[PDB]
Amino acid sequence: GSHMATFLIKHKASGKFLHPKGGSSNPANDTNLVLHSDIHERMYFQFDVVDERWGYIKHAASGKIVHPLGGKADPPNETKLVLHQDRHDRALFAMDFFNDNIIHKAGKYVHPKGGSTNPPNETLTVMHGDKHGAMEFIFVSPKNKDKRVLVYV
Amino acid sequence: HMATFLIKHKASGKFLHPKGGSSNPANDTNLVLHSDIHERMYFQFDVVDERWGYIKHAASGKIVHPLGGKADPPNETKLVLHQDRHDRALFAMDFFNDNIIHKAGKYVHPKGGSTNPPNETLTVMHGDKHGAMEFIFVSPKNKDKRVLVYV
């Protein structure tokens, strides 16, 4: 809904964060989502709850949301994650704050491309069905990157 | 308009109730499993700290406690309703793994661990994880529709 938490999406193994590539306040449609160590307001996210666990991962600065590129119902492994303005069911994710992962409605997870525990800055993110330590994410305060915050509001 | 929901034992389809089904259960009333549905078995969840909060009997405002209110209760500790609020009554509603976890790490179980507990079976804390300790949180008007308990 319109009341949302504002948080950082932190890759647990590396300590890096989800960013729009380039860090714009208003990324173009289909801008890749990457991992990067910087912290600033143009990498803050919100979670827009739609249907129980399901909702949109919203870029706070622009209002664009996370999508598997191309808007397929069941994206294959290695489908890149991007930002896009469209709001529809194929952009639904759940923020699993118990198992520490981000799961798409068709069942794959958000990963760093290549699956490293310690990826470099600018590493792309993709959908992949595998579960392992390098696909874990926690959701933390913009003012304290170690403090978990509740994203279901 | 806080979330109001049924706590459904996944394996059996029975629900969490105050023993006796009252709108006004006394302090230390046991929490049981039972198949009946009514407004006196609706629950709410009051968030305290991120994942942690109080599981609340909607009709009375009583919350779930380990009997005796200890921080780190042993296996088989009965679960009861009580009006007091304190940090030993904190639980998280894990709607991903489908369980209810206390702050010290044990889970809500049917006493005995059955996949098909009879009506009136007591609930307890126990550290084990298995299919008969799974619970889902559903709409009073549609017991198959999961609802978000955090809002």
- The DSSP bridge pattern shows strands A93-96 and A81-84 to be unpaired
Q: Domain A1-153's class?
A: mainly beta
A128: region left, alpha or beta (phi > 0 left; psi from -120 to 50 alpha) = beta
Residue B98 Cα, gap to closest chain A Cα (Å): 10
**Beta carbons of B30 and B79 less than 8 angstroms apart:** yes
How large is the C-alpha radius of gyration of chain A? 13
Q: What is the largest CA-CA distance in chain B?
A: 36
Q: How many CB atoms lie within 10 A of CB A93?
A: 23
> Euclidean distance between the first and final Cα of chain A, in Å?
8
Is the domain spanning B1-151 CATH 3.90.1150.10? The answer is: no
Query: How far is Cα B116 from Cα B16, in angstroms, rounded to an integer?
Result: 14
Closest by alpha carbon to A44, among A119, A130, A142? A142
Q: How far is CA B102 from the centre of its chain?
A: 10
Domain locations in chain B?
A: 1-151
B positions 46-75 inside 8 Å of A (CB): 47, 50-51
Task: Decide: residue A47, CB within 10 A, 0-12 exposed, 13-18 middle, 19+ buried.
Answer: buried
**Among candidates A96, A149, A153 on the partner chain, residue whose Cβ is nearest the Cβ of B151:** A153
Written as one letter, the residue type at B80 is V
B positions 14-33 inside 8 Å of A (CB): none
**Among candidates A49, A96, A149 on the partner chain, residue whose Cβ is nearest the Cβ of B50:** A149
Length of chain B in residues, anyone? 151
Which residue from B minimizes the CA distance to A102?
B96
Query: How far is Cα A103 from Cα A137, in angstroms, rounded to an integer?
Result: 11
**Beta carbons of A36 and A21 less than 8 angstroms apart:** no
Provide the experimental method for this PDB entry: X-ray
Which residue's entry shows tokens 């491309």?
A113
Q: What is the resolution of this structure in A?
A: 1.1
Give the tokens for residue B150: 């955090």
